Structures are given as structure tokens and as C-alpha cells.
Amino acid sequence: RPWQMKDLQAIKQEVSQAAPGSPQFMQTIRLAVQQFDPTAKDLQDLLQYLCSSLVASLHHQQLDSLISEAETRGITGYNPLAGPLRVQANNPQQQGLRREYQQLWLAAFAALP
């Protein structure tokens, strides 16, 4: 049950005025992420739709650092012999990795301003 075009259109329109990482944007994006239960691929699509290449790159770097610390510590469900967290989160049998990816994503995007 992935999102459709209308959901993305509403998500972008409702937060057109606000700035990335504002409380309003964080509310709406967090609700979307917690409601649709998407993988990393869909999150990348959503970010490409919402913010430009500059904000995309900044979030990419911040999320790289956050994932770096998180999975360098060692995580309950992460096994580094199978692939990067971006790929484990895309397997529907690793929901723990998917939820960790979602939370790192939202925190990274919130850490912009």
C-alpha cells in the first residue's frame, strides 16, 4: 500500500510555504513516514519531489553521518555481511532496519536549520 500521486501532491502543497525542518514540515513528514511505512527507495523519491538538489545533498550528508554512527555502534537487526543499511531497509523482512532508516531520515532532515 505505497502512497499514490495524490498523497504526495497533498504533502507537498500543505507545506509549500514552510521551510525544511520547520515544526510544521516535521509534523507532516513524520506523519507521512509513520503512516505509509515506506522503504529507503520511496523516501528518496519523496525527498527528490519535495526539496531541491542542494537540500537533497545536505540531507544526504547528514544522514550518511547519522547512519554511520548508528550502525558503527552496532544495531540489533543489522548484519554488515549482507549489504548497506540502504539495501537491508529495502527488504520487506527487515522491518527493524526500515524503522531505524525512517527515524535517521527524519532526524537528519530536521537537523538542517
Residue numbers in the entry: 13 to 125
Question: What did the authors write?
Answer:
The retroviral structural protein Gag forms the immature protein shell of nascent virus particles. All retroviral Gag proteins contain three canonical domains: matrix (MA), capsid (CA), consisting of independently folded N-terminal (CA-NTD) and C-terminal (CA-CTD) domains, and nucleocapsid (NC). During immature virus particle formation, these domains function in membrane binding, viral lattice self-assembly and viral genomic RNA (vgRNA) packaging, respectively. Our results show that HTLV-1 uses a distinct CA-NTD arrangement to form the immature Gag lattice and that, in contrast to other retroviral structures, the CA-NTD is the key determinant of immature HTLV-1 assembly.
To gain insight into the immature architecture of HTLV-1, we used cryo-ET to visualize mammalian cell-derived Gag-based VLPs. The CA layer exhibited a regular organization; hence, we used subtomogram averaging to obtain higher-resolution information for this layer. However, to account for the observed heterogeneity of HTLV-1 Gag VLP shapes, we applied local C2 symmetry during subtomogram averaging. The resulting maps had a CA-CTD layer that was resolved to a lower resolution than the CA-NTD layer, which we predict is because of heterogeneity caused by flexibility of the CA-CTD. In contrast, the CA-NTD did not show increased heterogeneity. Therefore, we used both domains as independent species in a multiparticle refinement using the software M34. This approach yielded 5.9-Å and 6.2-Å resolution maps of the CA-NTD and CA-CTD layers, respectively. The CA-NTD establishes lateral interactions that form two basic building blocks shaping the lattice: a CA-NTD trimer and a CA-NTD hexamer. The trimer is formed by interactions spanning residues in helices 4 and 5. Similarly, the hexamerization interface involves helices 1, 2 and 3 of two neighboring monomers (annotated I and I′ in Fig. 1e,h).
